[model samples]
Target: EFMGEQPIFSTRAHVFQIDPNTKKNWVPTSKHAVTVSYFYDSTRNVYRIISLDGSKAIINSTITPNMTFTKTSQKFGQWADSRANTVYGLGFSSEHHLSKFAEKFQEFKEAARLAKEKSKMELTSTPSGDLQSPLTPE
Candidate 1:
């Protein structure tokens, strides 16, 4: 009998980093180190980047160049409950697709930092839910 590969899937999150201390052409990977690809959507007007490993996404602020993104991949999570599962990724902007990021990248980066900081603060507790405990149980 032949056995198949077991599913070892995990969830990853993608957050936009504005300044990020990174250049305009900088490519960022998630904390879990999943690879990602970004593309422009013309008709609906949006920019989407997705993690290849966990299907997480980070939609760009707004950009619409006349150039084609024909090689770009399609959206992930197309199941019936995809809407619920994709609530986090539904932030594509139709109207602002052409909005430039030259000025706003800084703001986005700051917001990203704040978001990460907030998440860390909330998760300071462990499995036991002890608020005052140090993250490392040493």
Candidate 2:
């Protein structure tokens, strides 16, 4: 019912996937950090997280109202995708970057809820005019 595919937030991260059976070990999805982006589908009025690694999708989690980005450490955070039955871990370059990404994750989640329900809610504004995370390249 709407147009889709326009990035809302993007950052570089080294992706990891939890072992399907074990759920303890983090399976490395990429050898290096890749560009992970948060996208909004204007057509479906849905949100998504699209991570690319050499034309292949490493992180393709759909952003929904139920999703929660969990921060396990200073430079690491994770979130679960129910549709795909996978929990994705993102290794950030710093604590600040992790906090920023987590903030946006919840921010967009709130936005998605309001977009689908026109009955009014809390937490307004997508004032994230800045999306840059200066990751050290050393």
Candidate 3:
């Protein structure tokens, strides 16, 4: 278990949004934010975002030994690529600092990597040693 908390919330649902073909920033074609209702450890957190109408979260992490405790939820959307996807964890006490955030980010990245391996039935990195994939999973 992550920390001493119990697994509180869990559900599976879909949310949606529209996209632009050009990068020149324009108005949206549709409207809606992806909503995910899940209890983080022992706390409740909801993620909202405009872009991806649907997202199936494979796994997530939490803020441990929270020093700057606040109510906030991490957003999930279709990022441009792997490096762009920002999954943030909230609840920072007065003592929480950037160094802690950096440490957490590193921990989170590793957790995500392990989680991905568990979620996929078959996983393979770039055969050519590339970081990201240009083609669909085969």
Tens digit per residue, CA lDDT, model 1, 10-127: 2323322323234553233344434333333335434333335354344322222321221111221111112222221211122232122212333433444554454313756655
Instruction: Give the residue spans of candidate 2 off by over 4 A.
Output: 1-6, 22-24, 118-138
Best by TM-score: 2
Per-model TM-score versus the true fold: 0.21, 0.76, 0.24
Candidate 3 Cα outliers beyond 4 Å, as residue runs: 1-96, 120-138
lDDT of prediction 3: 0.32
Q: What TM-score would you give candidate 3 relative to the actual structure?
A: 0.24
Predictions: Cα RMSD each: 17.5, 17.8, 14.5
Give me the candidate number with maximum lDDT: 2
**CA lDDT of every candidate:** 0.31, 0.83, 0.32
> lDDT of model 3 at residue 6?
35
Report the C-alpha displacement of residue 72, candidate 2, in angstroms: 0.5
Clashing pairs in 3: 15-53, 16-53, 17-53, 67-93, 68-92, 68-93, 69-92, 69-93
Higher-scoring candidate on TM-score, 1 or 2:
2
